């Protein structure tokens, strides 16, 4: 069973700017297995809008090349849940953040969560933050994750994490 | 730093027979990332010999096809450490077992552990054993693992876990 717990009191304007994908996990191995997997996406920037919507700038491997992609996320009645239509997902969920160091988020397709749940640990600087990973793992503890990846500083500042 | 703790009091004759690869983890993402990764090997049978050596029967994806492979492991002065020359590894290490339900083991290349360390949780029946996974994760807690995979009952009785 998948139950996600979204952040209380999120202020979306404060997530603006540069981020790096430190770790990722998914419910289904095939979502992240291999560099061409559908949810192997590397977040570069979060750009909140004056409306309270959210643009997500990421890199992804498409047809043998590291491509730029932009996902537009629309705000909902819950401040930490956004609607999207990308990567066969329909929701972006913010689990936790302290704005200055780490942010944990998930994507899912609410119609098929077990087949679609992917979560990431983002950080502000291209270094390993063990405190952030511990928060990530504690969030993951109650979710049925079957693949987990964690990246090192060299991969964090590479193109598509290679 | 990589420090593995091998099992005290291992009786190798008692690991004989059928096993299934329930979970796997590695120090370097590329060791397990994608079905063709070098250490994506699925253990089918452990066959100890009268000499105290060990034959390991496994399946691996080679050139687009699920192939059978046999690794011969030679005993050393430490009962839980065996010498091999396969998969660019030189050691097989038994971390823990109760013989009847689970067995945890690693492979590594002692010259380059960070680049080569892969560990598995084996079980006797093609079911998820959460107690065995908890033992696996506790062993992994002190190792620098960057990729972890866990498989479900359908994958356990499939060909090359698909």
UniProtKB/Swiss-Prot annotation, chains A, B:
SUPFAM superfamilies: Lipocalins. Keywords: Disulfide bond, Milk protein, Retinol-binding, Secreted, Signal, Transport. Alternate disulfide bonds occur in equal amounts. Disulfide bonds join 66-160, 106-119, 106-121. It comes from the Eukaryota. It is found in: Secreted. InterPro entries: Blactoglobulin, Calycin, Lipocalin, Lipocalin_CS, Lipocln_cytosolic_FA-bd_dom. GO terms for molecular function: retinol binding. Its main location: secreted. Changing residue 148 to Q: In lactoglobulin 3=C. Transmembrane segments: none annotated. GO terms for cellular component: extracellular region. Belongs to the calycin superfamily. Lipocalin family. Under physiological conditions beta-lactoglobulin exists as an equilibrium mixture of monomeric and dimeric forms. Lactoglobulin is the primary component of whey, it binds retinol and is probably involved in the transport of that molecule. This is Beta-lactoglobulin-1/B.
């Amino acid at each position: 069973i998948i139950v996600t717990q979204t952040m209380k009191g999120l202020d979306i304007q404060k997530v603006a700017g540069t981020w790096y994908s430190l770790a990722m996990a998914a419910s289904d191995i095939s979502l992240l297995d291999a560099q061409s997997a559908p949810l192997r996406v590397y977040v570069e920037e979060l750009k909140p809008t004056p409306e309270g919507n959210l643009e997500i700038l990421l890199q992804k491997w498409e047809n043998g090349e590291c491509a730029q992609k932009k996902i537009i996320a629309e705000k909902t009645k819950i401040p930490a849940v956004f609607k999207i239509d990308a990567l066969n997902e329909n929701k972006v969920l913010v689990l936790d953040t302290d704005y200055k160091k780490y942010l944990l988020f998930c994507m899912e397709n609410s119609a098929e969560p077990e087949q679609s749940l992917a979560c990431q640990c983002l950080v502000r600087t291209p270094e390993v933050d063990n405190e952030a990973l511990e928060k990530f793992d504690k969030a993951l503890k109650a979710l049925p994750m079957h693949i987990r990846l964690a990246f090192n500083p060299t991969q964090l500042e590479g193109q598509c994490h290679v």
